[PDB]
Symmetry: none
Subunit: 300 residues, 2 copies
């Protein structure tokens, strides 16, 4: 078949008539019907319900239609992307901490891909310290993390203040405050599961920092390997855990998330680049972030 | 006898029923009638003509009733009167951490004082944790500190972000950077003097928080008793220290204060009050803070009114 067949079919489904679609396609109705008849026989499948006056699709017709608008949209994308390629083949390398996979970062990267069709993008999971060294050595070009950096060779900027939340078993008394929220102070005597167990500093450093900023130091603490351990163990009755809000991407039976009322019970997200960085590719990454944030209704 | 006896008797006389009086006093019938009996047997006279409904007094009981209600009334007046002659002098109690003595706090208090000449102002040196408990128990009315509070019964408000500075001996290599400043990262392998040694959390807890916020954990740390010890030992060649910028009120020979380039190398100042605080005395304290800040060229903290 040809793209003509797909375009002819889609117009008929959208206009809901053989003659009405012919007007927008600028052709006569007899040959338009033949093409669709030729498409159906070439497929050996009935796509349109015959013979409806306001034409309706069959089960396979509806399926083929949704596929077709997507395939024809890909052609449009192909053409548009080809005309905006960078002549010199570039690679951009991005470091990130694992917790960022649960929020906006992936769709930011995906959007970034589309802005530079021929750009090779390499993604590396690394902590903040590793990010700092990699940047200075030029092994990454941007790092996304949750900790501030002290280093004259690095420029870090606050992107957003994500809220912290408490993961609890549904039967925990604190789950009564699911819609109201609680204070860090309410958590002082709980069994608290910190994570990950990876090289420090990491997210568990931050959580304990947050308690410490409020004059608090929990003593019933257990460090577990990764987020899923923390949440799985909470779901199994082992205690509670503090998580970034986006970790709600994980929902488990009898696991519940409770908001925190302390204004500074937060986990900031930063972008780190080299101090003297001015690559258009990195400015473009910043704008992609801004684009996504705007769609989400963020400032900040 | 006790006042209880009088209240029980008065109730039976006034209701003319042991049941109606029992339901008025929120007690069972038996104790009511036994207690009156104890009174009657103690005084040696019959006060009530029991057996007859409605319940009425003897001649003796009728007289006793009149003295009893007056006596009970007199007791209530005694208590009310005693509450009246209790001190009319208003006292405001203010908690603060010692490091704030080097900055704007004393002049804020002095100005506050001038605004309220008949007010007793009491000042107590205490840490954020003790402040929090003192506020909840009403032992202070406002607390000034350098740490956030997590307690639903307390409201804390950021007043200003004070810069941290590095205190060094004048011959330290870091002091070659006095004009430009240095980074927290530059201090990681130095001998750092933390203070004070008073109950945690305190200023040393905050300094190490600042480091930890920036992924740093200095290992050459020595806790000393007080700020002057820290600065004195620096001046003596024992290491370096991190101080609030206002601590520059203390100047020692060959002691040099070096700026930090990290934007978040700061030590915030907070006022803490009870969650539902609305006393004009405290609003006035708060306005005094804003007036002093405006005079100093500091950004004013947000409006109360
Ligand atoms: Cl996010
Ligand atoms: Cl000050």
């Amino acid at each position: 078949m040809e793209l003509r067949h797909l375009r002819y079919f889609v117009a008929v489904v959208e206009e809901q008539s053989f003659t009405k679609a012919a007007d927008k396609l600028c052709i006569a109705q007899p040959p338009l019907s033949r093409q669709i008849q030729n498409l159906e026989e070439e497929l050996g499948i009935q796509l349109l319900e015959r013979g409806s006056r306001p034409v309706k699709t069959t089960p396979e017709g509806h399926f083929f239609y949704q596929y077709a608008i997507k395939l024809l949209s890909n052609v449009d994308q192909m053409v548009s992307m080809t005309k905006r390629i960078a002549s010199v083949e570039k690679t951009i390398r991005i470091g990130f901490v694992g917790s960022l996979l649960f929020g906006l970062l992936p769709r930011i990267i995906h959007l970034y891909r589309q802005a530079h069709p021929n750009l090779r993008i390499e993604l590396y999971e690394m902590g903040t310290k590793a990010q700092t060294e990699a940047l200075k050595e030029g092994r990454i070009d941007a790092g996304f993390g949750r900790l501030k950096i002290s280093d004259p060779a690095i420029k870090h900027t606050l992107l957003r203040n994500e809220r912290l939340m408490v993961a609890v078993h549904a039967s925990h008394p604190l789950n009564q405050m699911k819609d109201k929220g609680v204070h860090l102070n309410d958590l002082i005597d709980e069994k608290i599961l910190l994570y990950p167990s990876s090289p420090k500093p990491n997210f568990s450093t931050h959580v304990m920092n947050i308690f410490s900023d409020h004059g608090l130091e929990p003593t019933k603490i257990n460090e577990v390997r990764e987020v899923q351990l923390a949440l799985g163990l909470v779901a199994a009755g082992e205690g509670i855990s503090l998580v970034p809000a986006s970790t709600q991407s994980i929902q488990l039976f009898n696991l519940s998330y409770v908001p925190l009322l302390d204004p500074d019970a937060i986990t900031p997200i930063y972008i780190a680049v080299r101090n003297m960085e001015e690559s258009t590719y990195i400015y473009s990454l910043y704008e992609t972030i801004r684009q996504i944030y705007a769609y989400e209704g963020f400032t900040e």
